[PDB]
Design a protein around this ligand. Structure first.
Ligand code: MG
Ligand code: MG
Ligand code: MG
Ligand code: MG
Ligand code: MG
Ligand code: MG
Ligand code: MG
Ligand code: MG
Lengths: 232, 11, 232, 11
């Protein structure tokens, strides 16, 4: 608890300042601090946690892909440096994924009783196991993929019972599970069927929304469409 | 392009 | 010496991999390691050191300006959080500046005998004192500004005796000293006179250059011109 | 604009 001595409200305030400053490592440390106070997170606070770690692992994943690509070219028809540096980046990425999954397990998920909070955290759990799956190569890979699938499936079952088809969390979950199917599970047809069904069911529910909800739903539906255009 | 996944913030 | 156990050649190789991956903190740690081996740096190695720290302090300076701007708005016609977080960022920025100035003093500058190496390191010394000056507010500010001025002036005296007016290090030094005059020393007229004289003397020496040297010189001369257009 | 300073790499 590096943030153990700071007020919860001060950690949340500083997480917002870090977002404005694009200091995403600081933002993640502040939001880890806030979570470790042991209170549940509001909608906005869950978004701060998700934004902060998304951006930290986003930069690690982009770095890993650059290095892994240089490493693969070195192994076509040199020393250990490229492998060693890819491993260093990969190890730091796995640590950030382990930290997020740790917060979800201790104790965000078990205290999340509302559909919007529970689905949000289960989606995150799927996402961080998916990032681990992206770099996994040993004995653990099958179990990592199944941990992602299981978290996403539990989130999907709740979202389908409890949320309208245009709910941005439900739409964001479905988008991410479809990327899981395409990129990780080697199931491009499942990816394409989930993205299509998700898009079509949201389309048929747009008439119920305010101009502001409409704009949040259609932004994510456009990412389903961009993926389907790429995949078909 | 690359595969699009959801933004960190959804609403 | 965190990098004490890695080969100099491995640190340089990994600094290049970090640049490709845009992992500038890693790149700076690798190049600090290389410097601490105690050998002089080649031209390309000096560029790796300069790129790595430029990008690390670049992100700290951008963060500091966002926070300092929010802090100033809070003090017009709230709690300690904005001030506390600006101070945290400012303290980390000062530490990176102290680390660079430490490497220049121990022992890059005293072993730099060639004009291109000595001017490059003195320019850097001016630059990192300038970054300190940008956030300085107490008893030390006048001495920080004078440390910048003194490093830049020594670099300018050597560049004028030893380098042609189109030398990219000489041009980059003159550009940065002119920004010092305008932004730090409150001397906009000195800024404008140095940028003009630097541009005009380089223009008159372009005829001596290869198409490749021409392209390096004119890139930096365009930044002198952009500044003069902004300042006049 | 903001004041332009030199790139990290000069040549
Ligand atoms: Mg309290
Ligand atoms: Mg309290
Ligand atoms: Mg088919
Ligand atoms: Mg088929
Ligand atoms: Mg050796
Ligand atoms: Mg050796
Ligand atoms: Mg005048
Ligand atoms: Mg005047």
């Amino acid at each position: 608890g590096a943030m153990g001595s700071m007020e919860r409200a001060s950690l949340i305030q500083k997480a917002k300042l870090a977002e404005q400053a694009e200091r995403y490592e600081d933002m993640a440390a502040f939001m880890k601090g806030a979570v470790e106070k042991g209170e549940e997170l509001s909608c906005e606070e869950r978004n701060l946690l998700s934004v902060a770690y998304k951006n930290v692992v986003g930069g690690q994943r982009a770095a890993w892909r650059v290095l892994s690509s240089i490493e693969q070219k070195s192994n076509e028809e040199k020393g250990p440096e490229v492998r060693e540096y890819r491993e260093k980046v990969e190890t730091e990425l796995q640590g950030v994924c382990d930290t997020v999954l740790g917060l979800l397990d201790s104790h965000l998920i078990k205290e999340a009783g509302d559909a919007e909070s529970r689905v949000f955290y289960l989606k995150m759990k799927g996402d961080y196991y998916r990032y681990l799956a992206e770099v996994a190569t040993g004995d653990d890979k099958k179990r990592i993929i199944d941990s992602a699938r299981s978290a996403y499936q539990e989130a999907m079952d709740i979202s389908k019972k409890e949320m309208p088809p245009t709910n941005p969390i439900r739409l964001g979950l479905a988008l991410n599970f479809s990327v899981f199917h395409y990129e990780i599970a080697n199931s491009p047809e499942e990816a394409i069927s989930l993205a299509k069904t998700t898009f079509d069911e949201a389309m048929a529910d747009l008439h119920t929304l305010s101009e502001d909800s409409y704009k949040d739903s259609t932004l994510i539906m456009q990412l389903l469409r961009d993926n389907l255009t790429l995949w078909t | 392009r690359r595969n699009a996944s959801s933004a960190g913030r959804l609403q």
